[PDB]
Amino acid sequence: MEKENLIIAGKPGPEPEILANMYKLLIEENTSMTATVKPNFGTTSFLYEALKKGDIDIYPEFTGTVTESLLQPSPKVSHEPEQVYQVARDGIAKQDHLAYLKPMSYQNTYAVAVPKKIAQEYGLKTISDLKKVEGQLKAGFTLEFNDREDGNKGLQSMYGLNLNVATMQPALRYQAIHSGDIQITDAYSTDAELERYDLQVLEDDKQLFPPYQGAPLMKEALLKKHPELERVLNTLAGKITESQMSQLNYQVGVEGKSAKQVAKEFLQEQGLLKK
Numbered sequence: 532m533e534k535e536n537l538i539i540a541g542k543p544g545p546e547p548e549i550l551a552n553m554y555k556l557l558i559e560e561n562t563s564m565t566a567t568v569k570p571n572f573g574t575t576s577f578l579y580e581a582l583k584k585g586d587i588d589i590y591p592e593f594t595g596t597v598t599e600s601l602l603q604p605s606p607k608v609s610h611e612p613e614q615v616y617q618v619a620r621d622g623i624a625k626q627d628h629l630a631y632l633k634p635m636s637y638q639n640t641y642a643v644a645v646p647k648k649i650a651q652e653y654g655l656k657t658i659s660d661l662k663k664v665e666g667q668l669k670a671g672f673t674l675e676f677n678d679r680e681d682g683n684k685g686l687q688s689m690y691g692l693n694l695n696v697a698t699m700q701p702a703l704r705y706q707a708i709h710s711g712d713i714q715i716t717d718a719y720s721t722d723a724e725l726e727r728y729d730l731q732v733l734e735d736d737k738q739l740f741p742p743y744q745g746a747p748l749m750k751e752a753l754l755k756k757h758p759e760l761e762r763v764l765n766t767l768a769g770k771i772t773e774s775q776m777s778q779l780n781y782q783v784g785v786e787g788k789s790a791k792q793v794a795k796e797f798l799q800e801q802g803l804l805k806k
């Protein structure tokens with residue numbers, strides 16, 4: 532008699548769309564609620580604010596992003612993913628009363644990336660190596676990465692790097708680095724574009740980037756209304772490897788397949804969804 536509909540959003544990209552449709556498929560099979568997925572609905576701070584204000588109900592957030600962008604002041608965390616999740620989970624509950632569920636296994640980190648030929652021609656192995664050639668190479672970064680302390684501001688503070696940066700739209704940066712307009716971009720480690728374009732990830736030798744694992748973020752009030760959401764979505768906890776997410780991103784972003792159908796097929800193959 533109550534078929535409440537949940538709004539599930541995801542940041543720009545095939546990956547959050549896949550994850551949101553996974554949440555929707557799981558919720559509709561195992562609960563009495565429905566869900567609407569809002570693709571590419573906004574960047575981190577928009578979804579975070581929409582969640583607190585109640586314009587959306589759930590979105591997938593990443594552990595290092597909670598501690599680095601969402602928590603103010605940002606706590607000094609280790610590199611161990613489980614401890615970082617605990618700080619994020621406990622921290623985001625105290626600050627904003629948000630229930631951060633348990634993470635999936637794969638990490639999706641910011642990844643400073645250059646074409647393989649650029650790495651070989653310039654002797655680039657680590658992020659530190661970029662200081663050698665910061666006057667010769669052009670970088671194209673998302674605005675959010677430019678805005679973040681664990682992004683370009685961290686490249687400046689932690690490495691002393693002063694890159695020549697053009698601010699880029701997220702969906703256009705890979706084509707620019709492939710075409711030669713830029714030689715450095717802020718890749719995401721599960722992005723299918725890394726292998727497609729023969730990009731090489733530079734090693735985070737100073738460990739600017741914390742761990743990033745994804746998990747559902749929602750108001751505590753929604754969990755109180757619907758406690759079954761915790762068990763239902765936590766079937767993803769500790770699941771989905773890096774290579775599994777990458778192939779799903781490839782299926783949606785590159786092969787043009789429906790995010791819902793890709794999500795559904797993977798869930799069924801893995802035994803989390805009927806049929």
Ligand SMILES: C[N+](C)(C)[C@@H](Cc1c[nH]c(=S)[nH]1)C(=O)O
Binds near residue numbers: 719
């Ligand atoms: C996965 N990630 C690399 C840690 C980022 C990706 C991202 C940040 N902003 C947008 S849009 N996407 C994030 O979710 O914070």
